[PDB]
Design a protein around this ligand. Structure first.
Ligand SMILES: CC(C)C[C@H](NC(=O)[C@H](Cc1ccccc1)NC(=O)c1cnccn1)B(O)O
Ligand SMILES: CC(C)C[C@H](NC(=O)[C@H](Cc1ccccc1)NC(=O)c1cnccn1)B(O)O
Ligand SMILES: CC(C)C[C@H](NC(=O)[C@H](Cc1ccccc1)NC(=O)c1cnccn1)B(O)O
Ligand SMILES: CC(C)C[C@H](NC(=O)[C@H](Cc1ccccc1)NC(=O)c1cnccn1)B(O)O
Ligand SMILES: CC(C)C[C@H](NC(=O)[C@H](Cc1ccccc1)NC(=O)c1cnccn1)B(O)O
Ligand SMILES: CC(C)C[C@H](NC(=O)[C@H](Cc1ccccc1)NC(=O)c1cnccn1)B(O)O
Ligand SMILES: CC(C)C[C@H](NC(=O)[C@H](Cc1ccccc1)NC(=O)c1cnccn1)B(O)O
Ligand SMILES: CC(C)C[C@H](NC(=O)[C@H](Cc1ccccc1)NC(=O)c1cnccn1)B(O)O
Ligand SMILES: CC(C)C[C@H](NC(=O)[C@H](Cc1ccccc1)NC(=O)c1cnccn1)B(O)O
Ligand SMILES: [Cl-]
Ligand SMILES: [Cl-]
Ligand SMILES: [Cl-]
Ligand SMILES: [Cl-]
Ligand SMILES: [Cl-]
Ligand SMILES: [Cl-]
Ligand SMILES: [Cl-]
Ligand SMILES: [Cl-]
Lengths: 183, 183, 182, 181, 180, 181, 185, 178, 179
C-alpha cells in the first residue's frame, strides 16, 4: 500500500544500485531517474546500475533525457524488462550496456513510431509536423544504433505498433538475455 | 424567431433572388446556400443573384463548396459585405462577379491563412500537415485570382490576421464599390 | 410563445415596425436587416419604425444594422423603449434626424468598445489595433449623429455614461421625449 | 430551412438528392427514401446526387451504395466541397461517365476505423468483422475505379487526399468542370 | 437533409412501406406497430414492405414488433438494408417465408440477449432467470424461421455472429440476396 | 410521427384504439384518459381497444387510468404487446372480462409498489403507512380481476413475478393468448 | 491511517520484517512495483528463507501481474501463497504461482479464472494488431495456468472461456492451490 | 488524529474495525491481527466493531483471519454492527462477544449487481447465490441456529437490539458498566 | 496537523474535544481518547468539550455508551452550541458536572432519516427510526429528570434553548461566566 519502511522500499533498492522506471514516463519520472543515476555515479563510477523497466511509454523528451543520461554516465547499466517495455520503455530497455539487457520470460516489448498532435495556423502545423518527423527519424536512429539493425528494418517494424516476445525482442536486438531463473 | 408574411422573411428575400450568408459557415450553411443558388438558377439563369454576407468565417471545404457553386452557375452574383466578411466570408465576397462586389461603409474585411489541427502517428501528422498546406496555396490562388494581386502579396498579407476597411479591401481587390446610399 | 394574431411581430412588420430588442448578435442583425429590406421593397418612401430595447452586443452586428439603416431610402423613426445601451444607443441615434424618439423612463448608455485577445505578441497587437480602430470608428459615428465634437465623444464614452432621455436629447442621441402620442 | 416547402423538397422535384454532412443511419434513411421515391416517379429519368460529406458509418453508407446500384435510374454524383471516406465511395458509385466534381473539391480515401471491447473472444470477432469490411470496401472501390486491389490497398492504407484531377486519374470521378459545358 | 416534404416516410407508408431503422425501443415499437395496424385496416391482404436498418435494441420492444408481424394477415416483405443486427436480424427473419430480402453489401448479426441486474441475491436470481427465459425464447423464434436446430442456434448465437447476406440466406435468416 | 392524408395515432384513435406504451406518468395518464373520454362521447357502446406496452410507472397515474377504464361504459379490449409490467399488468387485467388479450411472445410482470421516504421520523411513518395502503389497495384490485385469493396475490407480488402469456391466463391477468386471429 | 509500531514504521513494514508480502486490491503497475521491490528486498536479506505472500485481489493488469509472476519464479526463495478473501483474475494466477506444496487458501476464500479482456481502437490495421496481441496473452496465460495446475491445455481453454468460480477445494482439485486449512495444522 | 491513538490501542491488543469494510480496511485489520498474534498467540485480541457493512470478500477475509489465529478474540459492538459487521461481531470467540446498551445489529442477505450477456448474467447470479448460502452457514455456525431460521431472518433487512441479538446468538453479553 | 498537536496536549490534561459534525470517524476518535484516559486513571475526571451541531445517531449512541461505561466522571461543557446528538452527550455527563458557557445554545429534536425501496423495506426502515425515536426520548428523559411526555412535546420539532433554559430542562447543571 504505502511506501513500505525498512526509508521507503525504493531507497533501500537505490542503496543496492537499483533504479525503478515503472509506469508512464514524464518529466517528473525523468527527473527522479536522472537524479538517482547521477547519485549512483557519484557513489561509484564503476559499479553497475540495475534499471528495472515496467513502463507503457510516455513523453519523447522525458525518455530521451533518461536515455542520454544512461549513455553519459560511465557506469554500466543492466536493463531488466519486467512486465512490459513499450514505446519509450523499449528504447530504455535497448539502451542498456551491451550484454546486460535482460528480460523476464513473460514480458512483452512494443516498438512504434511517435504519436502527437498539432494545432494552430498552417505555418504552426508545418513547424510542429516537421519537428515530430525529426523525432521519428531520431528515435529510429537510436533503435538502429542499439539493435544494430538496418534503418530499413527499423522503419518497417516501427511504422505500426509491433509487439515482441522476449525471445523475439532478443532476435530483433532489443535485449540480450531471456532468463527464467538466475544462472 | 423567423417572422412570417402573407412565408419566412428569408423566403420572401429568396423570391427577390437574395441569399443570406450570415453567421459561421459550416456544411449546413453550405447546403442551404448552394440549394438557394441552384433554385435561383433554375428559375432564371440570366437574372442576377444578390448574396448578402455577414460571416466571421467557417469550414474551408464548406466555403469552397459555396465558392465553386458561385463560379459554376451562369447567373451574375452581387456580393454585399454587410457588417463583416472575415475568413471564408471575405473569399465569398471577392468571389462575386467582377464589378458587382459591394460593401457598406462601416463593414470590415479580414483575411488570414487557414488554421486547423492534426493528431495521430507521425505519418498521419505529415498527411494532415501536407493537406492543410495544399489548402493554403489553393486559397491563396483563389484570392490572387479575384483580387488581381500577386501570389507573393497574398502570402505576405494573409500570414497573420489582416483587417481592412471597405476602401482598403477595394484597393486590395476584394470588393469593387463602397456605397453609403444607393446612387 | 409568439401569440398568433401569425406572430405579433409579423403583424407589426406589416405596420412597418421592426423590433431590435435583446442583445445584438449576428442572428439579430440578420433578422433586422431582412425586415428592413423587406420594408424597403414594399415601399422605398413609407417610413420604418424601429423599436430598440437593447443592452448592446457585437460591434460588427450593430454596424451591419447601422449601415443598412443609412443605406435604405426610407426614413427611420427609432424609438428607445426600456433601455438603449452600447450598440442600442448607436442605433437609437442612427435614426433619421428629428425622428429619434424615446419614452420618458428609458435610459441610454454609451461607452467604449470592449473585447479580448489571445495568442502570440504579434497577434495580440493586431487585435489591439483593431479594437482601437473600432473605437475611433464608433466615436466618429456618434459624433456624426449627435453633432458633437470628437473631444466630447471621447470624454463621455471613456467610462460607462448613463443618460436620461433629456440628457441624451441634450447630447444629441435622440430628438423627442414624449409621454403620449404626437 | 427556407420555404418555396423546404428548399430541399424543391430540388427533389428537380430529381436532386443532397447527401451533405456526416453519414449515419438517419442520413441513410432520408437518402434511401428519396431515391426510392424518385424511382417510383420515373425509373428512367436520372437522379442527381450532390455529396459534401466527410464520411460516416460504414453500414449506413453501404445502405446508400446498395440503394444506388439497385435502382434502375442513372445517378450523377457531384462532389461539392469534399467527398471523404464514405462520401468518396458514394461519389465513385455514380453511373460510369456521370461522376462529376467541382474544381476546388477534395476527395479523401482511407481504410475503415472502429473499436472493439470485451473478452479476447469478443475482440477477435470484432477484429475479423472490421477486416471483412476493409476487404469489402476495397473491392467496391476497385470495382468502380477500375483499379487493381493492389493499388486500392496501397492508397487506402493511410489517409490519401486527392484533387478532383487526381481522383479523375484514380477513377473516383469522371469529369472536373468549372463552368457547365 | 431534414424531414423532406408531408414527411417522406408518410409517402412511403402510402406505398405500404414501413421503415424500421435505428435502435429499437418502446418508441420505435409504438410507431412500427401503429403503421402495421393502419396498413392492415387499409387492406388486410396487400403485402407490407418493412425496411430494416437496425443495430438492435430492447428485447421486449422487438418482440412487440415480431408478434404484430405474425398477427396481421398481410404478407410482410422484410428488406435488410445496411445492417440487421440483434433484434433487427430477428425481424428480418420474421418476414413472410420467401419474402425476406437483403441488399448485396448488408450484414446480419445474431447474438444472445444482454442485460443487467441489481438488488438483493433473491432479486438477482429473479432477473437472471427472466434473462435466460428470453434467451431460450429468442432461440426458439430464430429456429422457427431459420428452419435450423436449437443446437445450431445456441452455437451460433453464443457469441456475436456476423454473417453476409449469402451466409444469412444459407442459415435461413433471409430468402433472397438481390444483386446487380 | 408519420402523417396520414394527421399522426398515425390519431388514425388509430378513429379506429377506437388507445395506445398505452412506454412508462406511465401523469402526462401519459392525461392523454390516455382524454382519449377514453373522447371515445365514450363518440359512442358509449362501441368497444375501445387499449394496446399496452408499458414497463410500469407511477401508482397514481396508473390508478387514474384504471378508474377511467372502470367508469366508462364502453367494453375495453386490452392487449399485451411486448410487455405489461407493474402498472402495465394492472391495466391489462382491468379490461372487460373475456376481452383481455396478449400476443404469444409478450410478458407480464407483477410486483409490490416501490417508493421512497425522507424527513423526520414522524414524516417517515406517514409516508410508510401510505405506501402500505397502496400495497393492500393494489392487491385487492388484482384479486378482484384475477379471481384469485388475497393470499395468492400477496405470495406472488412480494417479489418480481414474471409470467408468460399462458401463465398470466391461468393466473387470471388476461383471457386469450392468440397467435393469428 | 496506517498504524505505527514502535525507529517507527507502518504495520506492513512489521509484516515485511516477518517476510510477509501483502498483495491485496487491484493489481496495476504501482502494486506490481511494491510487490516486486519487497520480493527483491527479501531475497537480498536471505535467498533461502521462505517468503509468505498473502493475496486478496480481484485482478488487475495482465502485464503487472505477469511482472509479479516472473519475479516470483526468478527469486530463489520458496514462496508460500495464501488465498485470503478472494483471488480473482490475476490474483488466482499469483496464487497458483507459489512454490509447489506451499499454495494455501483459507476455507471461505474464492478463486476465479477467466480469459483476459481488453479493448482496441484505431484503423483496421491497428485493430488487427491489438486483437492478435490480446490472443497471444490468452495463449500465454493458458500456458502458465496449465504449467502450475498440471492440467492439459484443453481443460484450461474450456475452463477459462467464461468466468469460472471455485471454492478452495475446487481450486485444489483443479491444481490452483495445494492445501485448504481452517486452523493452523 | 492525536504516535497515533490507534497504535496505542494496538499496543493494548485492540483492533478497531469501524466504518465500511473494503479490501483496504480488510488488509489493515488482518495486518493488525497477524502482528498481535506474533506478539503473543495466547493473549486475547479485542476487536471493536462499528461498521455498517461492506464487501463480502473483504469481510470474509477478516473472518477467516479471526478463525485462523489462535488468540481468543473479544468482539465489542459499539454504535452499530450491520451487514458484515454483525458477522464479525458473531465471529468472536464463544463467550467473548459483547455489546454496549444502545448498539444496533442488522443482518440481511448479500446484495450486488451483474451485467453482460445472458451466459455471464447466469454466472454472476449463481455466484452471488453461493455467497448467500455461504454467509448463511457462517451465521448459523456462530449463532447456533438452524440454516432455515437464517434464511428467514436475513431474507430482508432485520434490525435487532443488543438483547435481541444475544437471543439470536450473535453476541453473548450486553454490558452497561464493567 | 496544525499546532505543535494541541489536542494531544489537551488529552494529557484529560480533555476530549467533541467539536464539529459527529460521524463514525469522530466517534472512533472520541471513544479511543476516552478509553486511553480510563487506562491512565479510572478515577481522575475526564473533561469533554462539545461544540457540535449534531450528527449520526449510531455514532452519538456509541459515544454515549462509552461515556456511561467508563468509571471516570465526565465533565461535559457546552461551548458554542450543542445541537441534536451534541445535546444528548452534554446531558450524558455525570450529574452535577454538566456545564455551559453563557452564550451557548442547545437544540433538541426528534431523529431524522430516510428510506427507499419496496413497501416492505420502507416499513422496516420506518419501524427502526421509530425505535430510535423512543430510544433517544428515553435517554433524554433519563438524564434530564423529565417525563416522557415533556420529552415528546419538546423534541417533536426543533427546540432551541439557552444555557439557563437547558439547565431548567435538565440538559446541563451549571452556567458559568468567569470561574
Ligand atoms: C514512440 C516512442 C519514442 C514514444 C511513444 N510516445 C510518443 O511519441 C508521445 C506520446 C504523446 C505524448 C504527449 C501527448 C500525446 C502523445 N508523443 C510525444 O511525446 C510528442 C512530442 N512532441 C510532439 C508530438 N508528440 B511511446 O508512448 O513511449
Ligand atoms: C483562412 C480562411 C481562408 C478560411 C478559414 N477557415 C478555417 O480556418 C477552417 C476552420 C477550422 C476548422 C477546424 C479547426 C480550426 C479551424 N479550417 C479548416 O476548415 C481546415 C480544413 N482542413 C484542415 C485544417 N483546417 B476561416 O473561415 O476561419
Ligand atoms: C461600445 C458599443 C458601441 C458597442 C459594444 N459592443 C462590444 O463591446 C462588443 C461585444 C463583445 C464581444 C466579445 C467580448 C466583449 C464584448 N465587442 C466587439 O464586438 C469586439 C469586436 N472586435 C474586437 C473586440 N470586441 B456594446 O457592448 O454593444
Ligand atoms: C473508410 C470509409 C470507407 C468509411 C469510414 N467509416 C468509418 O470509419 C466508421 C466510423 C467510425 C466509427 C468508430 C471509430 C472510427 C470511425 N466506422 C464504422 O462504421 C465501423 C463499423 N463497424 C465496425 C467498426 N467500425 B469513413 O466514413 O470515416
Ligand atoms: C440479442 C437480441 C435478440 C436482442 C438484443 N437486445 C438486448 O439484449 C436488450 C438490450 C437492453 C435493453 C435494456 C437494458 C439492457 C440491454 N436487453 C433487454 O431488453 C433486457 C431484457 N430483460 C432484462 C435485461 N435486458 B439486441 O437488440 O442488442
Ligand atoms: C407496483 C405497480 C402496481 C406499480 C409500480 N410503481 C411504483 O412502484 C412507483 C415507483 C415510482 C415511479 C415514479 C416516481 C416515484 C416512484 N411508486 C410510486 O409512484 C409511489 C408513490 N407514492 C408513494 C409510494 N410510491 B411499478 O410501475 O414499478
Ligand atoms: C484474465 C486474467 C488472466 C487477467 C485479467 N486482466 C485483464 O483482463 C486486463 C485488464 C486491463 C488492464 C489495463 C487496461 C485494460 C484492461 N487486461 C489487460 O491487461 C490487457 C492487456 N493488453 C491488451 C488488452 N488488455 B483480470 O485481472 O481482469
Ligand atoms: C449482506 C452482508 C454480508 C454484506 C452486505 N454487502 C454486500 O453484500 C456487498 C454490497 C456492495 C456495495 C457496494 C459495492 C460493492 C458491493 N456485495 C458484495 O460484496 C458482493 C460480492 N460478490 C458478488 C456480489 N456482491 B452489507 O451492506 O456489508
Ligand atoms: C435527533 C438527534 C437526537 C440525532 C440527530 N441525528 C440524525 O437525525 C441522524 C442523521 C443521519 C446520519 C447518517 C445517515 C442518515 C442520517 N439520523 C440517523 O442516523 C438515522 C439512522 N437510521 C435511520 C434513520 N436515521 B442529530 O442530526 O445529531
Ligand atoms: Cl553508459
Ligand atoms: Cl435612411
Ligand atoms: Cl446492388
Ligand atoms: Cl444505378
Ligand atoms: Cl403476416
Ligand atoms: Cl369499461
Ligand atoms: Cl521461487
Ligand atoms: Cl480463534
Amino acid at each position: 500500500p504505502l511506501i513500505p519502511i525498512v526509508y521507503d522500499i525504493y531507497s533501500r533498492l537505490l542503496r543496492e544500485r537499483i533504479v525503478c522506471v515503472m509506469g508512464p514516463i514524464d518529466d517528473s519520472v525523468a527527473s527522479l531517474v536522472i537524479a538517482q543515476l547521477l547519485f549512483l555515479q557519484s557513489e561509484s563510477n564503476k559499479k553497475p546500475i540495475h534499471m528495472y523497466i515496467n513502463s507503457p511509454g510516455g513523453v519523447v523528451t522525458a525518455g530521451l533525457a533518461i536515455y542520454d543520461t544512461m549513455q553519459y554516465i560511465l557506469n554500466p547499466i543492466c536493463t531488466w524488462c519486467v512486465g512490459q517495455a513499450a514505446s519509450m520503455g523499449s528504447l530504455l530497455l535497448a539502451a542498456g550496456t551491451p550484454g546486460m539487457r535482460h528480460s523476464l520470460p513473460n514480458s512483452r516489448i512494443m516498438i512504434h513510431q511517435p504519436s502527437g498532435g498539432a494545432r494552430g495556423q498552417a505555418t504552426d502545423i508545418e513547424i510542429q509536423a516537421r519537428e515530430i518527423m525529426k523525432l521519428k527519424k531520431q528515435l529510429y536512429n537510436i533503435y538502429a544504433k542499439h539493435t544494430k539493425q538496418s534503418l530499413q528494418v527499423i522503419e518497417s517494424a516501427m511504422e505500426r505498433d509491433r509487439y515482441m516476445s522476449p525471445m523475439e525482442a532478443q532476435e530483433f536486438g532489443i535485449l540480450d538475455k531471456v532468463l527464467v531463473h538466475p544462472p
